[PDB]
Amino acid sequence: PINSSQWIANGNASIFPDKLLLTTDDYGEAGSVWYYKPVNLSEDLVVEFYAYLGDNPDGADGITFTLQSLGTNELGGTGGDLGYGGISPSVAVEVDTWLNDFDAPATTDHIAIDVNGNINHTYNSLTYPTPNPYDLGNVEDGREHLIKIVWNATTKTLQVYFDGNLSLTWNKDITQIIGNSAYFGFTGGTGGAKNLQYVKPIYVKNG
């Protein structure tokens, strides 16, 4: 059900017939998988996918959905960088499964909006600004979670749903950050703690 010709894998990521593997259950990884064709952010974008964050609550580090206007070879840092940190220009929705000192004010596994490769929630809230991270409780439960991301190119808003629940919204024009065209894809990282991490894209609608 995945067409491997449409996806470009970097680092420790791999393309499988039914999933995009971001990290294996091993230390120090970074992986990214980009879709081969950019999207037009002067039109609406809806992305729905299942996310698997692992079966170890004491594991790490998490995944992103990322929009970025560089191209299909990009790979961000390992560990708490989630395979994303350092990528710019970009907007990411992270599902973060390890609390770093820079993760305040998160207190559990959390979902957050990051900008231009910055994974520090207080810096982003002071600079852009981005919303506070939203605590999910433990999502390293060995289950697939449904994530939906909605960009509205008329209101200039982003919504994020997790297991059917509205979790984050934002009113920044992301096209003023990354431009009107972007590649989309997924990243993950592991560090001194680890988890098997993957996504299963379900639906992408642009306009």
Note whether 103 binds Mn ion by CB under 5 A: yes
Q: What are the beta bridge partners of residue 152? A: 157
User: Considering the rule CB under 5 A, would residue 140 count as an interface residue with Mn ion?
Assistant: no
Q: What 3-state class would DSSP assign to 199?
A: strand
Binding-site string for Mn ion from residue 13 to residue 32, where x marks contact by CB under 5 A and - marks none: --------------------
74 contact choice in Mn ion, Ca ion, none (CB below 5 to 8 Å, kind-dependent) = none
Applying the rule CB under 5 A, the residues between 33 and 92 that interact with Ca ion are 80
E strand or H helix at 4, and its extent? none
In whole angstroms, how close is the CB of 205 to Mn ion at the nearest point? 27
The SS3 assignment for 66 reads strand
Among Ca ion, Mn ion, none, residue 98 binds (CB under 5-8 Å by kind): Ca ion
**And the tokens for 41?**
């952010």
Residue with tokens 């989630």: 82
CB-nearer residue toward Ca ion: 52 or 98: 98
Candidates 7, 84, 98, 183; binder of Ca ion (CB under 5 A) is: 98
Distance CA 105, CA 96 (A): 13
Q: Which among 3-11, 96-104, 124-132, 171-179 is the span making contact with Ca ion, rule CB under 5 A?
A: 96-104
Residues 11 and 83: beta-carbon distance below 8 Å: yes
Name the one residue in this structure whose structure tokens are 């506070």. 132
Q: Which residues bind Ca ion (CB under 5 A)?
A: 80, 96, 98, 100, 103
